[PDB]
Design a protein around this ligand. Sequence first.
Ligand SMILES: [Cl-]
Ligand SMILES: [Cl-]
Ligand SMILES: [Cl-]
Ligand SMILES: [Cl-]
Ligand SMILES: [Cl-]
Ligand SMILES: [Cl-]
Ligand SMILES: [Cl-]
Ligand SMILES: [Cl-]
Ligand SMILES: [Cl-]
Lengths: 220, 220, 220, 220, 220, 220, 220, 220, 220
Amino acid sequence: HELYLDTSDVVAVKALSRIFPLAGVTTNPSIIAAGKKPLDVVLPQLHEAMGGQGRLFAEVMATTAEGMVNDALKLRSIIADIVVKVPVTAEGLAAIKMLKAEGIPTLGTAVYGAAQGLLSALAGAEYVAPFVNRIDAQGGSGIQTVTDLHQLLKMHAPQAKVLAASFKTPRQALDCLLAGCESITLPLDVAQQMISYPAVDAAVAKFEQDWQGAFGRTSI
Amino acid sequence: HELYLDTSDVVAVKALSRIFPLAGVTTNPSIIAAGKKPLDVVLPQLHEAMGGQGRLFAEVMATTAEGMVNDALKLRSIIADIVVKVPVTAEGLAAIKMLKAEGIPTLGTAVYGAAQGLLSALAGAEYVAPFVNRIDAQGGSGIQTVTDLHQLLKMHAPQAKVLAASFKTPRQALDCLLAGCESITLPLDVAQQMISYPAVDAAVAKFEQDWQGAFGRTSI
Amino acid sequence: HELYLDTSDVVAVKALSRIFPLAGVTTNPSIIAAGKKPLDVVLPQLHEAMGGQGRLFAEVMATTAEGMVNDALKLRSIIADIVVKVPVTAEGLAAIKMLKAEGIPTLGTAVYGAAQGLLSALAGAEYVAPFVNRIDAQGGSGIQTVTDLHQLLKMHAPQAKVLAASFKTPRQALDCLLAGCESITLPLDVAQQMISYPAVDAAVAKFEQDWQGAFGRTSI
Amino acid sequence: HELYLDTSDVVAVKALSRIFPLAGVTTNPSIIAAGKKPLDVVLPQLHEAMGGQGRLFAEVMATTAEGMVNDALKLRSIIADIVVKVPVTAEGLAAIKMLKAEGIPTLGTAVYGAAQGLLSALAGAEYVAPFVNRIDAQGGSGIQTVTDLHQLLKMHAPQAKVLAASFKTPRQALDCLLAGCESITLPLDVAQQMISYPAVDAAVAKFEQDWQGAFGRTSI
Amino acid sequence: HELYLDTSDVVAVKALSRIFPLAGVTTNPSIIAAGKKPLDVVLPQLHEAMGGQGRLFAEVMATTAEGMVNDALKLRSIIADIVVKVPVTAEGLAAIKMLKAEGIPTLGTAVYGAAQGLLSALAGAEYVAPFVNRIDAQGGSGIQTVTDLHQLLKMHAPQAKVLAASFKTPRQALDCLLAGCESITLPLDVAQQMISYPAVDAAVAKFEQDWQGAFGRTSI
Amino acid sequence: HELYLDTSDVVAVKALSRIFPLAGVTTNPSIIAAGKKPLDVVLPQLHEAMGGQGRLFAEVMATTAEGMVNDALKLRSIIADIVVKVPVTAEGLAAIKMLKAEGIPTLGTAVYGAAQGLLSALAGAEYVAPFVNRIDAQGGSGIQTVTDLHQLLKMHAPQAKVLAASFKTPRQALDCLLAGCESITLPLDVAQQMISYPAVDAAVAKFEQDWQGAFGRTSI
Amino acid sequence: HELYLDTSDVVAVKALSRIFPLAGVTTNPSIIAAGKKPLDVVLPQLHEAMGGQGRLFAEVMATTAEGMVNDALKLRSIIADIVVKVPVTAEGLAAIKMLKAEGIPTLGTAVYGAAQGLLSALAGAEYVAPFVNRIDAQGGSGIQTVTDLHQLLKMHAPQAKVLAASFKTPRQALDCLLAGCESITLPLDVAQQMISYPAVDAAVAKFEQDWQGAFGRTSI
Amino acid sequence: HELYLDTSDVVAVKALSRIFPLAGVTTNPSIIAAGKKPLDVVLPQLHEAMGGQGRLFAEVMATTAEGMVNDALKLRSIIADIVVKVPVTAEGLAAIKMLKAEGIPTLGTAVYGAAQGLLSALAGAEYVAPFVNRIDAQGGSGIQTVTDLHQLLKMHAPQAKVLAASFKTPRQALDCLLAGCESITLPLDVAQQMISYPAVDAAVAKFEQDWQGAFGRTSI
Amino acid sequence: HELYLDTSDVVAVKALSRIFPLAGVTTNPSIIAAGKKPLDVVLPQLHEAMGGQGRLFAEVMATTAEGMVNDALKLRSIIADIVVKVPVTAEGLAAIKMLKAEGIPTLGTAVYGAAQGLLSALAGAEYVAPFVNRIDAQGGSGIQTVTDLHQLLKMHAPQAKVLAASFKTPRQALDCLLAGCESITLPLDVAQQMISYPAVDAAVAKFEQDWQGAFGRTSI
Ligand SMILES: [Cl-]
Ligand SMILES: [Cl-]
Ligand SMILES: [Cl-]
Ligand SMILES: [Cl-]
Ligand SMILES: [Cl-]
Ligand SMILES: [Cl-]
Ligand SMILES: [Cl-]
Ligand SMILES: [Cl-]
Ligand SMILES: [Cl-]
């Protein structure tokens, strides 16, 4: 399983890479815009913040397939092994086919439906990113979409993986993991919630208090 | 998975072959009739419109097994590697057996029931095409028929594949894919719906607006 | 159960009112636009085409709540007992509340989610119209949305009914009916498919042939 | 069904009361603290922002049952018919029993488990508020807890209602509604998401474009 | 729903009756033996510890039906309205029939199977007490037994109620409540766990901290 | 619920009538034959052994409807209010109709299928007796047959009851009770197993030992 | 999968062997009796009617194991590779074991229960034939029996196959195929129904009418 | 699958070994006691009655682990390759471990719970024998216990097999087989029921009558 | 499957290692504190009590990752091959990553949620220990958490095993085993309950009584 953070916050990535078993960092245009640093600045900084080991993802902006390929080349000049995110639209699918022919790995993003996601994998995408919370917020079922998508990839495009994205609560992430998703990307707030629990803190405090009671200290 | 378009519209096939990851094009007598061009004109055009890479399918018209075999030979003289569609009737099954003996690949079409479909595969058909929407429109369950048929082929005639056909909505196609169908053929309207979504367009617009807000342009 | 036709085709309404047990006719802005006749011409014609017995529905066009209320008054001046369709948007909900206070019956339309639909009923709508095929075509589950919506109304706003709408195949309509929808509106092609079956025609022909064989005629 | 907003934002309540069919407003200590206005200021402002029709809820702060009863009296002196929220702790349960004897309506809050919630209803609470997202975020299932709690109330304390609370996504609210909850309280962001959908906006725009095409305007 | 404590600890009952919404107290021979006080001392103390409002249950010791009836009379001379617990054995069933004829309310106890429990209700018992944890500890399913028993009573002896007993964890009690049991009796440790949660304490502390931050105190 | 014993053992009936809440005794030709006493001897003895209050059932032996009616009269001359068991065969159904016209209550016996059983109830039988273990032993599912039969009676012949019969293990009886059967008849061995359990005996012994430990006696 | 016809109608077999993909023909004593030709006449005629390529099955008549073995030798002298059908009775099982030792392939027939069928496979039968319709007609579930039998063979005697038999409707055959049966034998009427459908004929007629409309003929 | 008879009846074993495909014979202390012959007489007779090919099982009587090991050695001196049955108690588990170290194969018997059974396999037992009917008779579910036990062995101790035992009806044996049990032992009455069916006899009789009708005899 | 005891009771471990098939012993800070012996005394004693064959586990006490690594080194200096338990907190995850790099095997403990548990396995833990009863006691579902966690490990971190812990009743342990947990640790009371059953003792007593009846002794 590959676990990513969905962020352009370099300081946070450096701090959290020590804690989480990260495969890398994913970005998108809104995340990059929120951080205010251009791609040629922030991508290398994110790469460094993971000690040069993590995989990076970043998204094209052009609206024609040819423009998207040119964007991909720009991204790859910044980070040689970056995975290029392409929105799964008509022109995006055309771009994914072209990038497959060029040997540049892609992720099919802005996926709101399972068939849409599958098309991107059939076209060559290595990863497919459904926007779980967007589907949930807009009256659908993000989890059903993810469940369906994973099944479709495993039956029909088995080289491709779901990279589940767009989360407001740990439960959504848990449900994607239970559906079999082979990768996931978490925003910082959800990631931090997933490792901090009042019940866990209470269990550890009880261990400390019992140890103190018997041995007069809380250290080993 | 093999994805086909169900059409005789040469201009559309050329345009869509750039977008979709197509395995080829399927035709039937109504589709050919609607396009108004004879088989010896349209089939070579369709073959060219896919850059010579796609598989083609076309259907016999005769009502006796012997006549269907003669139709198959005519079709194969137009396109050497064409897959011949035979309606799964008593004479059709007899024809499928004869074509198997001749080494000509066949598809069993006009399938309205799972056992009917299985018989065509046991007789030698490489593909079996249930008419999903026809079953749905006539008070049955196209999806249950497809689900059943796919299970029957995988248990009892595992060399054969379901090629699901006859669709009025993307949901029918999705449900066939979730049932495991190893091939599918889409009419142009359903195919175009499967890659165009208001929610996806809105996600892409939001990315563009956020990028504009931060960087003063919408390009990378 | 209330069965409606979703059309502005006066000739077809006449012909089908004799066959179907219709409660009335629903229109929307696309349906009215397609027919090319203004509301003050077509609505009285549709009312006549059902022999003055059917209920009519038509939709507001304004984008502010106050404008929608004014549109409702215009519609009611054309057909005194017409049910006014209001899209379930923020201003639409505000309009539904105002129309409830005025005693004008409403339908909440353009429903793509169950919670959205429920809000329109809580605001006062007597009917809620999910767009089943639109949800299906855009990667969701129209049938799950209808199932959920009907359950929500029956638990939380039991005076309101689902009026299921937007269909490409009889199976969608059947599934809405099996989910419990107390009303439905069919486009003409789907309505005609629901009463014409090759197997039924074959059963009737067999009855006629057997009768002929025994009695020398096909009449009673 | 009773629909509440979970907020102390008086301007927003006034604006949203025109759109949503609100039963009232719920507050808690964090919400009140975030708004920075004391109870004796903000509660009367909220009451007015709903035109004097909505029900209000506010929470005690004391940690002994006797202190909580005194807090309840203070709250009722600000808003005569306010429902008093009491955290479901040992002293909270004792307070709920005392308030039942005094005839002051209560809500059992900070519910993280179904049995805990049931105990508050058996003690006399009219409403029980599970913290759905808190349970979800801390590795449980908020929806299973709500489902279980509602069943427990309907079997064992049928005068009491679930008032589902603590939401980060509309899907959580939908699932609570489907589980049968007779009341719910939404934060502003989730409430606004529940009434704004790209697919709905696109449907309305298509209606406008079709109308414009036929009639040369977008008004009725 | 009737909630009981399964104890002979008078001091604890007095303390917990202020917190829990108790219907009364159940005792059995082991519970009485553990407390070391005879029945004619402890039963009146328990009755007072609940302020004279709670129902009491206590168990016969004799092994013949006639002896059990005599024990019932002794118990009723200590507490006039006490419910008499009879083990569901052959002689116990005979005793339950006799006590029904005498108008003395009974509970069928030491139930390890659903049919056994039903027989006690058919014989006249008002309550039937499966030993949930005993069934669980001995390789069965206490919850399945309770689920089955409650269904049997509601179908076949609807005047009788399950009084679920014998618990080591709150989850067992929750599952009995979800199965529909109309009464339950909790040992003190499980009852205390059901009202004390680290996550709830943390929620209350966060409320206090937020209030402090804004207003400079933790009181209302 | 009506509980019967399936026996001709008069001594056992008398002993068990004190323990079980019996509605009566059922006999059949094999049971009567096994006991070796003629009907005119054993039926009165069984009636007395229940203190003149139990319902009795006995079976006809004739193979024609007319003969079965005559047998019914012979049975009624021995026990005036006896319920007459008739095997559900073609002649048996004819007899059941005749007996309905005469006002003599009947039970449809030797039922091996649900539809067969339903026919007997539609003909007038007050009770229908599937042979559960016979169906089980002969490769069917006695429990499915009972489940189906009970549903059929409640939907289609609601005045009739299932009287489940033919048991080798308590589990079969439990499963019939859980399926909703309103009456049941148990052979003596199964009945005795249903009230004697090693685990229950161990619970009672533990209560006695704990009481002895604390109070120096095992009596109350 | 192996598909058989269940018939002694030599003319029909010859005609149908051209249409169906047949593995052979099964006979039984009633089928042979109905055809009125002795085994030494009809078996060679059936073998010829399939062009010498189909497998044959025929049934022993003796009631002792030794007699059944002698019958098997007689059958094998008529058709050297015939599969010998043995009814699964006590003596039949003994015969199956003896025939296994002799290397003569057997089928266990007249199977009305799954355990009975499994015993025949454990004894050495290569095929097991449940009588589906007989089980259905006699108040059981033929499909459950087949489903269970197939599972038992695949777990416990995996060299053996279910040869499902005894059908009145195509739906029974479909359900056996869906249960996984690796062979089936169809009576002629059911086989003919499985390849003849009014809806399929209507689809083919529509293709012809559309082709005629466009090209002025119905031939290719 | 290994099929055993649960008996000490030497004459019956000889007769049935010709009919059933037996793997051997199991005995227990009650079975041996019922036959009245000592182990050193009956075990060699049973071994002979199966022609020297069947596996035998017999049970230790000692209550300490050391005594059980001595009993195992005595049993193995009578039948060199006998499988030794050890009750799964604390001392039994200790004995199973010792016998594993000595290389003497064991069966863990008197299993009334799945975890208990699993422990015996983890300790070294090759077979684990749940007492299905005992669990059923005592208010549990023998089939759930067997289902659970088989799952536990296959996951956690895959070298061990369930040997299901203790049966009063063929249905119990069928359900154990459907649960996957790799071995089973049947008492003689259940075994005989499993091969004798009135419906099967009637099928064979009909075949005979039809053959007679056509050919004037009932032989081949 | 690996079975552990959760204890620091050296005498009990020695006694139980003769009965149970133990893989080793787990300790935690409360267990060690309860035993009152320091780690450098008790761990070698536990190791000896299992004859030097069992695996041991013990827990770090430090709150920073660097401190936890130092604690791990101290533990490994006491017992060279000990598995080091680390609480799954932010610093614990950081420690698990460091220990993975150092090649020191770890267990992720104090797990109250499935995602939390998975993170510890992704970070390098060989075992993950959910606190089953703690989750149950605090209003969750310990069994659902274990079920989910095991599925997550098998899909996403297949080198890791669930070591289920924290039990009050054998049923909890059974349900963990049925969920697939590859290891488990039992407190002494639960372990002892799992091998002691009144029904089993009664079965063994019946065997002894039958043997006595036939042979005049209870020994072999
Ligand atoms: Cl994936
Ligand atoms: Cl397929
Ligand atoms: Cl409705
Ligand atoms: Cl509620
Ligand atoms: Cl109850
Ligand atoms: Cl009934
Ligand atoms: Cl098979
Ligand atoms: Cl097994
Ligand atoms: Cl595991």
